[PDB]
């Protein structure tokens, strides 16, 4: 096991990196990286591929149609493209996308990906949070997946071991790219922010992969901190700091 506790700065969490070359895992906090939790918006990595496979979307410019609803997040108040919806974690766009796919198609795809518990039984999500249609099975609801399962899922998608078309995977790779101010490495990923009301802990995520000098690492950074200030964006900062200190050479 490895120790990346310095990059977490006292925040409760864990990290797992996987190299498909030597089939080796670098694990910080084994018990946490094996614990299933709601994926929150990291599910957009998979819902993007589902939409492309089913023809609901077709490109990084694809739009779903904006009904004018004024959302708290003003970055959601427009007919945004796939790329924008992914980068802004736009829930209304992805809920409208998944509502165009029958549950049987989603179930078969998650079962074939071995996506954690593959439980989409609470389709509409946890409505007792009063957010109405801004809910879904992937947002603090029935679907749960461990950080290790996220990395195993990322590896199968990007190494070409799934049924998804390489054309759709290339679209996903493009919208996942993030700027880390280091052209020697390529970082891709998706943030996730949720609060587990039952256990009173955050589900803060950053899931993706790193490409550096012929080597590829699939990773999942996760926080279960008590402090609601700990969000996906904060875990993304921790991930970049882990990458800079332990994966630069």
Numbering used by the authors: 40 to 288
Provide passages from the article that reported this PDB entry:
The structures presented here are part of the C. difficile 630, R20291, and Y384 sets nominated at CSBID. The overall success of structure determination for C. difficile in both CSBID pipelines was 7%, with a total of 23 unique structures and eight variants or ligand-bound proteins determined.
Clostridioides difficile causes life-threatening gastrointestinal infections. Herein, we report 30 X-ray structures from a structure genomics pipeline spanning 13 years, representing 10.2% of the X-ray structures for this important pathogen. The Center for Structural Biology of Infectious Diseases (CSBID, formerly the Center for Structural Genomics of Infectious Diseases) implemented a structural biology pipeline starting in 2010 through paired efforts with systems biology, bioinformatics, and other research specialists in C. difficile pathogenesis. This project ultimately involved 335 proteins linked with pathogenesis, metabolism, and antimicrobial resistance.
